[PDB]
Ligand binder design. Sequence first.
Ligand code: HEA
Ligand code: HEA
Ligand SMILES: [Cu+2]
Ligand SMILES: [Mg+2]
Ligand code: NA
Lengths: 227, 104, 71, 514, 47, 57, 44, 49, 139
Amino acid sequence: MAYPFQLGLQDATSPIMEELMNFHDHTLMIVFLISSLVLYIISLMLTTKLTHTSTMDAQEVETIWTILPAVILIMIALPSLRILYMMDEINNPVLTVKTMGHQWYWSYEYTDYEDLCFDSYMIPTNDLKPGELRLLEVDNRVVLPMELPIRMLISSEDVLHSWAVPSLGLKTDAIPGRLNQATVTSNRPGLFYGQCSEICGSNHSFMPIVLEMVPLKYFENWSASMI
Amino acid sequence: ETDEEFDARWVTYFNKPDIDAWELRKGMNTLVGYDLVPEPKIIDAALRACRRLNDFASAVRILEVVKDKAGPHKEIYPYVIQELRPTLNELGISTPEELGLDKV
Amino acid sequence: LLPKPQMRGLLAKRLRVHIAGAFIVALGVAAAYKFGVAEPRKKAYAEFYRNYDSMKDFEEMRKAGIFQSAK
Amino acid sequence: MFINRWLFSTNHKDIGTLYLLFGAWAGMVGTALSILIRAELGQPGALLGDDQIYNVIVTAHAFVMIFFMVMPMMIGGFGNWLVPLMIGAPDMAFPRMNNMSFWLLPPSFLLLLASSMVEAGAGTGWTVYPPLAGNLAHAGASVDLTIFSLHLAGVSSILGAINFITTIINMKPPAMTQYQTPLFVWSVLITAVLLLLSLPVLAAGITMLLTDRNLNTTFFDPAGGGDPILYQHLFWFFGHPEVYILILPGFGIISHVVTYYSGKKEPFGYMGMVWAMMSIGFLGFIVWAHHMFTVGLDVDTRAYFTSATMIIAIPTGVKVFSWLATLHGGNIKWSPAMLWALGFIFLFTVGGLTGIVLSNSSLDIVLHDTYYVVAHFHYVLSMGAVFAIMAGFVHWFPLFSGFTLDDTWAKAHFAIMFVGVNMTFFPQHFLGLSGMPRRYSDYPDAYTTWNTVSSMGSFISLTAVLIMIFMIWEAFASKREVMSVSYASTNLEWLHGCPPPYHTFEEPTYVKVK
Amino acid sequence: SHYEEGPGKNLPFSVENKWRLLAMMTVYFGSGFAAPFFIVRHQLLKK
Amino acid sequence: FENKVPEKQKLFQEDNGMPVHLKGGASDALLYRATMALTLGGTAYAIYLLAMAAFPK
Amino acid sequence: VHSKPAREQLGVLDITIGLTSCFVCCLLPAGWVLSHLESYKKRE
Amino acid sequence: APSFHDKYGNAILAGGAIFCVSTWTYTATQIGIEWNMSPVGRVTPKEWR
Amino acid sequence: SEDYAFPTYADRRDYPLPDVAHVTMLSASQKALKEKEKADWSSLSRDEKVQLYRIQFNESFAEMNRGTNEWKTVVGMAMFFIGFTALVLIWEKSYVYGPIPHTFDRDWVAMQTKRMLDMKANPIQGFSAKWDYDKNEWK
Ligand code: HEA
Ligand code: HEA
Ligand SMILES: [Cu+2]
Ligand SMILES: [Mg+2]
Ligand code: NA
């Protein structure tokens, strides 16, 4: 769910998103540092009036101009490897959920016990029941429990897709014959919205992702109530 | 790259007796290229050279370019003109402020 | 009688004081972004996840009959 | 006379003339495609209907703007005008394949037009990722027409790269060290070397895809042991070297216009300039998987690729600081070329830093193929390379035709296009951070406002395109000549007349013995 | 000499008549800007 | 086989005004008209086939 | 770069015609297609 | 008077400023394009089923 | 012909003293002026000095470093053509853009706001954090 006049990210629900946004504003204060620096330098030499068109000394400033941006890039890069290690941590797979991107829709599979596969279609604008969001709603939501690291095995049937929920913080390409593993966690229940992010035919804009996460008891109540 | 010998080599290159127009202009232009408001001794030698080479316009262009090279701070040009007070009335050269090119 | 002003490296001194100015205003812009939005977001997370209760939030979402998991 | 001089051209001046004409025509086509895309993306809803035709429009936008505008404008065009006049060469080394490569380009554009004609359409994007381009998702000939257009453009680029490398390292005066040429020659040399090492890679990839469709083979078919990830690897081993192709003559042109109109007889740190150029050339081939952070690669491979991407970030920063240093200390003549160069410096800086924000790997795990990437490459390409093209265009136009440009109207063009591209390309930061992906013909309610702002700015850029083509007409109609050109002592191209005659450097330059 | 040189003589198009030049630039850039719009209308008729 | 290079080296350095692609004689001019008549005729036939693919019946 | 005077100076009217001339035929095609997209849309 | 930009420069300044602000207000407000305003503070949430 | 090959007159603070004078022709008055220039240095007056400067150099420093109004002509022209762009936008809303989807209606917008407030969309600082859930107003 994105709100109008949004400038940053959709707010965090997952701890991995919490460190993503912390590192994100670290990178933003770094880029604002460099941008303000180059602005003041440009304004300095456009506002000056003196002239020096003699032989300029070259081998004096490239040393600092090489070493201190190296420090800036390495302090940028270290938390990137830290977050990569956080995705490299081991799992506690209470559930395994598989996504199968079909031509212009999705199919979600819960197969740990009593195999069930359901189809995430697209709801139309004229068939939108009152009060909903346009271009996002699905008649069959994807049900998860909260506070649990769940495996996400992501593939596609006939064309490339890209399962991408930006609020929770997941984006992996659904590739035929190559299913990627994504660790889905959060801290809240409710609805979470995302999109397909790879071009996949004549309904590429019409594949959303809706994930509703609620207490475990309601999760097996749902799973028993369908069948 | 010491300043006093920089000044000495510039003043002796400017007051060499067989100075010509092309090398005078070359010396003035490559000294303007330096980040250095010229010494009044250097400007004095340049005025002596323009005395030998018969160019009012080159002399007052040297005065105008040291005025331009003074920059945002105006105190440089009264300073250099108060050291070049005897040579300006000795050579008959008029300041660009006197002969009216500062104003339009 | 005017005295001798700075005649050597005028733009050098201006460049030195202005790159010092560049550094201080660059850290000023970075700290402006920091103190404006970086730690207020962190304090927002701290307040939300100190006062947060997941079952209470789920029940007040569920009270209007919205999820099809719980009807 | 006409068919002897222009259709059978063997001189680099008229070859660059016809490059400039074809690049202007391709710029017109790409501008029209961008305006149509923004016509989708200025108001929510299916203005056209399906988005397959919209994907055709964005594919044509990408192909026409990359392969037919920027490279024929500055790499072919400006190189072919400049580098013989830059190094004192009388002509290019192999003008006959130079003419072959030129006349190879309009068949590629015509094949792409035929692809747009075919009812299947090229609904793939710049990436031609199978199995979308296979026989099942695209049961037609349009993607085959695009692949053959890529063949035509690729062999033209290979021939031009061979000619450029041969001309640069062969027919400089013999007493000249290779580290003594002007920096546009170095930029186009590294450009041609990377073209030579990256264009057979596209040839391999698109022959692989063509054989995958038409000859029942399984290179990227999952039902035959193949994998599209191989095509992604080959296509991005192409792709990041190709975007560095699209930026390096920009580096050269902006360096030349800065050192011209800044009053310096030499740019700051020539050795540092050439070292940074060769460094980003060398590192451009080993960072190709920063577009691959979400595909599912090994995690240590991802760590290496983002670290090496920081290693490609550093010497570009050395290049930028050398530009600021050579701007320092010089009186600024306010020609529009400096306005384009300063716009290039600031907008390329913010675009490259946006690229770094992408370059952090987990930030691509949140931020891959959104409009944040769109903002990145439209900052660094759609006005980086475009502003560099504009700087060279308004700089060497008195050399190209003999007629000058009027500064007031030219700066009016600069100001309106600067405002238009900023208003167009600044909202996609919020569009990508808020999280909408690429290739969408309609957008949600949160993205409506910034999409409308971007489309309005794009129409401002269209008005700038109008004022540019009017300005070309106004120059060619007023026909005021060139009285004199400054800094011809340092710039070799400006001293042989404005414009230079048909046969230049019939008498070779007397290079100093040292 | 063998080919005529001078300001405006190294272009493939004539320059002397500014109104004819305006007409040819108008039709040239109009075809350039009109090609993708006729693509989209041709595909709309085809679909 | 006989060394016929120097006699063919006299038939091409003649400054008679023909360009290098036409000095050999009437065979070369016939062949150049032949490669004009099938390239341009082929290109015109190519754009007709592309238009026939563009517009169904 | 100093420039020689325009051999064929353009009058107020000439500039007016020039600017409009292209704008007109450089946006006319665009307007036609965009304005009638809905008709074109008709499979008829 | 002798150069083009002395008084006609101010004339183009005033004309461009007035023309720009008038047409931008016209296209932003009086036509009927919606900016999709931020629903915070300005709209009360009506009940949905 | 020869103008590009010959050294040319130019005026900038970079290159204050060009190789060639501003004028090339010499009138009889200017020849007499050069004769008095070769004459006594304390016997040449103000108007001879200024015309000597005029014939040697075209534009003086003070009259070529001036801030002239081309910049405001630029910004005025830019505002003019952005106004023409706004006219194109008026046309582009009036003609090509048809009906808008019904989800943007005021009642539909209000119910959508209520729904995504009930969901508590991004409620830490983004959207639902500014709504009072107990008093049923905003903040
Ligand atoms: C002009 C062409 C161009 C150029 C130069 C670049 C340059 C760079 N690009 Fe980009 N890129 C593209 C064209 C280009 N790119 C295109 C066309 C795509 C998408 C294609 C598609 O999706 O189809 C793309 C996509 C792309 C992605 C894909 C994101 C995703 O989809 O997940 C990434 C991420 O790593 C990336 C990164 C970079 C980086 C890190 C640089 C760097 O080289 C930038 C370096 C420049 C700088 C200016 C560095 C900053 C340095 C300073 C400011 C100096 C001061 C610094 C300090 C003091 C520390 N590019
Ligand atoms: C050279 C490369 C280039 C240039 C200039 C542009 C320019 C522009 N691009 Fe482009 N764009 C791409 C390359 C480029 N783009 C690529 C590679 C993609 C990805 C495609 C994909 O998703 O697969 C893309 C995608 C892309 C999208 C994504 C579509 C989608 O995902 O739904 C959008 C939409 O906003 C967009 C918009 C624009 C706009 C509004 C401009 C404007 O800036 C247009 C104005 C710019 C100019 C007009 C250039 C200047 C040239 C001239 C003025 C004519 C030249 C003539 C002379 C100089 C005489 N671009
Ligand atoms: Cu890359
Ligand atoms: Mg992809
Ligand atoms: Na649309």
